[PDB]
């Protein structure tokens, strides 16, 4: 039945700025459209119903407009806690959600704080060896991590994971984990993780030496 074409699928805007999301319905939905904010860890929150009606308690910098098949939703005076995914919803005939729009706040670029950790003595008893590198509080999200063993680049056994954007300082963090067997780990002595980010042409390098302790 009724399809809801929500665009763009992602948005990036600066503090104090304004964004607009478009929703296009496949048929006339007679102004029965609603808009929701969804943060990871919470249930959806109603912002606007019947095209433009602000739900009491929602800041008036949230707004909606449109009629027929064409609708829009806007947020002005953007704040860091506006980071979320937003959805339109038609309720003219049963219910259909749009595909969602993920909103990023654009802060000043920031370089990562980088930390490297050897495998724990506890883990080594299992026969496995995870080397962990944290790259914390950077912006933008795009970043490159390079592992070196004895100064030679290593590409297998690496697993990376990014946090969501932080609702308060608008930064990202990421972890990179290199997992080896204990025997391979103990065949080499130098372990390095190198972070390359647009904030500098120079990588940020953190290393340790594996010795007998």
């Amino acid at each position: 039945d009724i399809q809801m074409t929500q665009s763009p699928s992602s948005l990036s805007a600066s503090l104090g700025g304004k964004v607009t999301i478009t929703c296009k319905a496949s048929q006339d939905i007679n102004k029965y459209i609603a808009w929701y904010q969804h943060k990871p860890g919470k249930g959806p929150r109603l912002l606007i119903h019947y095209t433009s009606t602000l739900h009491p308690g929602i800041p008036s910098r949230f707004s909606g407009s449109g009629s027929g098949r064409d609708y829009s939703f806007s947020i002005s005076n953007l704040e860091p806690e506006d980071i979320a995914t937003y959805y339109c919803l038609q309720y003219d005939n049963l219910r259909t959600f749009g595909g969602g729009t993920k909103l990023e706040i654009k802060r000043a670029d920031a370089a990562p704080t980088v930390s490297i950790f050897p495998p724990s003595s506890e883990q080594l008893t299992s026969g496995g060896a995870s080397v962990v590198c944290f790259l914390n509080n950077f912006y933008p999200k795009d970043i490159n991590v390079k592992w070196k063993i004895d100064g030679s680049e290593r590409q297998n056994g690496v697993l990376n994971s990014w946090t969501d954007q932080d609702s308060k300082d608008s930064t990202y963090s990421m972890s990179s984990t290199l997992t080896l067997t204990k025997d391979e780990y103990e065949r080499h002595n130098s372990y390095t993780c190198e972070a390359t980010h647009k904030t500098s042409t120079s990588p940020i390098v953190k290393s340790f030496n594996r010795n007998e302790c």
Binding site: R95, S120, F134, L159
Partner: protein, 220 residues
């Protein structure tokens, strides 16, 4: 105020069925309709269907015809979603929400996670991440939480009293087991002089383990 209380997380075998519940207070479900919505982990919101508890009439999105059966108990003020023949495509958070058009979906249950997997429930190994002897004003420590199933785990530091300096990373799944890591940053003057402990709770296994971060041995 209105309150919607959903049943707890479910770990379900592929091919099996499961029944979720949603109990209302502050209104009678007789007076309205009750709806269910799906959210696959990193995807969108999908309407499943609704019931009119007064006459038990139901409507479903064609996508969920057969898959989903919605029911309600008037004198229990509850609504239910039964899901049949489960696949990994059915792994998702499921929400109950109150019907009516004015306003629309204002009240939501807290969501119920359904994980569809043949994998065995396994508590995590928890490993401390203490720095090598190279490590200004702050120091970063961490915790590696390895080899558990299913999601989620909750990782905290000093039972939450270290909150501001904490990053906990999304888990990665490999060979039927999850691994994640968590970092915490504290003033260097406070560790190791004061205790820093990562706490790892795994609801599915009813386990809660603490691991103290002890400085590395090396300098004796």
């Amino acid at each position: 105020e209105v309150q919607l209380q959903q049943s707890g997380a479910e770990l379900v075998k592929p091919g099996a069925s499961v029944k979720l519940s949603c109990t209302a207070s502050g209104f009678n479900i007789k007076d309205t309709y009750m709806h269910w919505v799906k959210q696959r982990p990193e995807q969108g919101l999908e309407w499943i269907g609704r019931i009119d508890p007064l006459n038990d009439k139901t409507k479903y999105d064609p996508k969920f015809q057969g898959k989903a059966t919605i029911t309600a108990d008037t004198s229990s003020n509850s609504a239910y979603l039964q899901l049949s023949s489960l696949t990994s495509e059915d792994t998702a958070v499921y929400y109950c929400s109150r019907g009516g058009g004015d306003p629309v979906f204002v009240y939501w249950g807290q969501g119920t996670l359904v994980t569809v997997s043949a994998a065995k429930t396994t508590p995590p190994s928890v490993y401390p991440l203490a720095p090598g002897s190279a490590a200004n004003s702050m120091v970063t420590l961490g915790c590696l939480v390895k080899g558990y199933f299913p999601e989620p785990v909750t990782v905290t530091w000093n039972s939450g009293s270290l909150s501001s300096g904490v990053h906990t990373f999304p888990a990665v799944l490999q060979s039927d087991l999850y691994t994640l890591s968590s970092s915490v940053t504290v003033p260097s003057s406070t560790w190791p002089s004061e205790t820093v402990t990562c706490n790892v709770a795994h609801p599915a296994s009813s386990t809660k383990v603490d691991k103290k971060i002890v400085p590395r041995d090396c300098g004796c």
